[PDB]
Amino acid sequence: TATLGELAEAKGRYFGSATDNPELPDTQYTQILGSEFSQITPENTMKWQYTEPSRGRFDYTAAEEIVDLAESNGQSVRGHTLVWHNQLPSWVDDVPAGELLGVMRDHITHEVDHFKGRLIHWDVVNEAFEEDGSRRQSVFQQKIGDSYIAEAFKAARAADPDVKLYYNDYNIEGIGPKSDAVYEMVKSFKAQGIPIDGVGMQAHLIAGQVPASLQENIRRFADLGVDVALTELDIRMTLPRTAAKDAQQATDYGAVVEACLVVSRCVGITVWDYTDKYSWVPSVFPGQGAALPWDEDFAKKPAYHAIAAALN
Ligand SMILES: O[C@@H]1[C@@H](O)[C@H](O[C@@H]2CO[C@@H](O)[C@H](O)[C@H]2O)OC[C@H]1O
Ligand SMILES: O[C@@H]1[C@@H](O)[C@H](O[C@@H]2CO[C@@H](O)[C@H](O)[C@H]2O)OC[C@H]1O
Ligand SMILES: [Zn+2]
Ligand SMILES: [Zn+2]
Ligand SMILES: [Zn+2]
Ligand SMILES: [Zn+2]
Ligand SMILES: [Zn+2]
Ligand SMILES: [Zn+2]
Ligand SMILES: [Zn+2]
């Protein structure tokens, strides 16, 4: 009957999926992508390695294809991601330290300006913290210093006054050292007038290990004056699949969805793609996989039932 996107929208939220250009030829895949979800996130082609492959020369070719596709289906789009230590073209490291801030600002200005009025959110800075809450020592942190994050958000806001600006990261679903650091940063930004509208919890989880403090963590951020979104949701398991593992995964998805629906400022959920067929998990986590609601043959898993039930 009703799709996840329609059920979510009925409750003032979106339910989307990320997708990548190489997947679009798969007709069965795109059919579900366009009808089941209300929001889309470019999995890769909006990243620095693609949009500014050589200094000062921008390329939005691939990203454009995804945005148009979403627009064709009446789906909103989240920009992802402007500043990140990964998938960064090699020339960025060669930029003289004293010039990096200008370069980062420029990269942000061109990409944000280019998609102005077409996206709902922008993951401005991605994965800036270590698990212990300290700053990740990326090229930006090292050469620009602690203010690089704030400067990135300022630059984004200056290029597009209406798009929601998000700080995105993983392992910040539960209350702990990492989410605490993000919490303090957001608190600091609001105090100093640094633009920031939301926190993106990637939610790359492990079946059976969903943080019990998830709901409370989402709420404390909401109380700070920012929205929250689960941006790259997947719940991986150690292969092979079993009815028991599938069932645990279903319970987990249901719990995650309920946690969001309980908090007024949790605006939506995006799964990092929706079918195991194209999940990034097997590639990065050896021996793990089957992390999405649809399996490799597009069969809806028990996890889908749980999500739909939670959305009601
Ligand atoms: O490159 C990053 C991955 O290393 C990261 O994987 C996180 C590692 O800790 C696990 O507990 C998390 O579940 C897992 O997602 O994900 C983000 C990616 O950019
Ligand atoms: O295909 C892979 C992408 O799905 C992957 O996306 C990253 C996963 O970790 C998250 O923390 C990042 O925000 C997200 O962009 O990047 C690697 C690519 O090979
Ligand atoms: Zn994909
Ligand atoms: Zn090109
Ligand atoms: Zn276009
Ligand atoms: Zn342009
Ligand atoms: Zn704490
Ligand atoms: Zn199957
Ligand atoms: Zn069912």
List keywords for this structure.
eight-stranded parallel beta barrel; monomer; thermozyme; hydrolase; TIM Barrel; binds zinc ion; 4-xylanase; beta-1; globular; binds a molecule of 2 linked components (XYP-XYP)
Task: Give the secondary structure arrangement, pairings included.
Elements: H1 4-9, E1 14-19, H2 27-36, E2 39-42, H3 48-51, H4 61-72, E3 76-83, H5 91-94, H6 97-114, E4 121-126, H7 139-144, H8 148-159, E5 164-169, H9 177-192, E6 198-201, E7 204-206, H10 214-222, E8 227-238, H11 243-262, E9 266-271, H12 281-284, E10 288-289, H13 302-311
Parallel strand pairs: 1-2, 1-9, 2-3, 3-4, 4-5, 5-6, 6-8, 7-8, 8-9
Antiparallel strand pairs: 8-10
Helix pairs in contact: 6-8, 11-13
One zinc ion binds next to loops.
Pathway: Glycan degradation; xylan degradation
Enzyme class: hydrolase
GO molecular function: endo-1,4-beta-xylanase activity; polysaccharide binding
Order of helices and strands: HEHEHHEHHEHHEHEEHEHEHEH
Total of DSSP H or I helical runs spanning 4+ residues = 13
- CATH class, anyone? Alpha Beta
Distance between the termini: 12 Å
- Percentage of helical residues? 40-55%
How would you classify the helix and strand content by structural class? alpha/beta
DSSP strand content: 15-25%
Radius of gyration from the alpha-carbon trace, in angstroms: 19 Å
Give the overall shape: globular
How is the largest sheet built, in terms of strand order? 1-2-3-4-5-6-8-9
CATH topology: TIM Barrel
Report the major sheet: 8 strands, parallel, barrel
Query: What is the CATH-assigned architecture?
Result: Alpha-Beta Barrel
Unique ligands = a molecule of 2 linked components (XYP-XYP), zinc ion
Total number of domains: 1
Superfamily (CATH H level) name = Glycosidases
- How many individual β-strands? 10
